[PDB]
Design a protein around this ligand. Structure first.
Ligand SMILES: */C=C/C1=C(C)C(=O)N/C1=C\C1=NC(=C\c2[nH]c(/C=C3\NC(=O)C(C=C)=C3C)c(C)c2CCC(=O)O)/C(CCC(=O)O)=C1C
Length: 313
């Protein structure tokens, strides 16, 4: 990725089709409204930043919340959370726990350097393990691609699931499409490299899933916008509740897409393509289904690696 522009809240340039690759998508200082986000110190547990919609999801508000520690707010999680995410642990490692404030809320924690980042969202799978050998017994790559997208579509219920594949020069192709009936096909159509730009592809090699639950949903800011640990922007690259590039949201809206989700197909640490999903209406894929998709993305990743790197016999 080319060196990123400062974010808008630090007086950075407006994003246009000419400057694309340098939008700092990983630091929008805001999240998507269907969840809440705290950041806490990785040693003390003191909550530092807090998305200002946190009231809606946590009972007590930013007026009486950013003081006290994680030890006091999540007393039965804090110990396990620390052991799970030790200092130096990799970015994409995450602690999960379902818990009910007065119910049922999904907690996802990960650490960046010395910051713990906590995502909260409402919540309450084997139909995968069945269509498992359909993937295994697929004759070739095209057949593996169609099985993959049909399978995702059955789990998720999404209107359109595609398998997007990157050429050496970074331009993509929709090599498989499973879709609601009546839609004009993308299957076989090719798109410029800039449609998923270098910085995004890169964020997408080490953060395998990302979504826009609602394409016409205002991002809610973190307060304060900067990490008080550092006085710099907060990395949200690994926070699924991360606010999406407003530019990409426009492109989604133009396609009539209310909800978007993609998962990365990585072959040998090098981004192979994406399972890309569209849905006509705003939709929050539940955390359990997202977990099933991350898993499917890893398996599909390895199935692609053996099937494609044996298009030799
Ligand atoms: C720099 C301006 C941009 C132009 C012009 C553009 O086309 N994209 C631009 C910026 C970004 N795109 C981002 C993500 C992204 N783009 C796509 C593209 C497609 N989706 C489709 O369905 C099809 C064809 C049928 C195409 C070509 C995808 C799949 C993704 C990411 C995955 C997803 O949202 O599903 C992006 C990053 C977004 C983010 O913040 O995560 C930017 C900045």
């Amino acid at each position: 990725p080319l060196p990123f522009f400062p974010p808008l809240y630090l007086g950075g340039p407006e994003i246009t089709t000419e400057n694309c690759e340098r939008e700092p998508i990983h630091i929008p200082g805001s999240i998507q409204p269907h969840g809440a986000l705290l950041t806490a110190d990785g040693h003390s547990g003191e909550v530092l930043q807090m998305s200002l919609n946190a009231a809606t999801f946590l009972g007590q508000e930013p007026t009486v919340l950013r003081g006290q520690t994680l030890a006091a707010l999540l007393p039965e999680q804090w110990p396990a959370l620390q052991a799970a995410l030790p200092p130096g642990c990799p970015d994409a490692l995450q602690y999960r726990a379902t818990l009910d404030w007065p119910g049922h809320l999904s907690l996802t924690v990960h650490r960046v350097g010395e910051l713990l980042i906590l995502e909260f969202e409402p919540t309450e799978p084997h139909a995968l393990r069945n269509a498992m050998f359909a993937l295994e017994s697929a004759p070739n790559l095209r057949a593996l691609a169609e099985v993959a997208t049909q399978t995702v579509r059955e789990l998720t219920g999404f209107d359109r699931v595609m398998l997007y594949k990157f050429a050496p020069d970074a331009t993509g192709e929709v090599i498989a499409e499973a879709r609601r009936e009546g839609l004009h096909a993308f299957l076989g159509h090719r798109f410029p490299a800039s449609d998923i730009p270098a910085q995004a592809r890169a964020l997408y090699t080490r953060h395998l899933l990302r979504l826009t639950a609602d394409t016409r949903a205002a991002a809610v800011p973190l307060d304060p916008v900067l990490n008080t640990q550092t006085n710099a922007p907060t990395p949200l690259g690994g926070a699924v509740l991360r606010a999406t590039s407003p530019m990409h949201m426009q492109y989604l809206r133009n396609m009539g897409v209310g909800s978007s989700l993609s998962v990365s197909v990585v072959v040998g640490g090098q981004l192979w393509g994406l399972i890309a999903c569209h849905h006509q209406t705003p939709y929050v894929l539940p955390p359990d289904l997202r977990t099933t998709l991350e898993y499917l993305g890893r398996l599909l990743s390895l199935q692609v690696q053996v099937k494609e790197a044996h298009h030799h016999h």
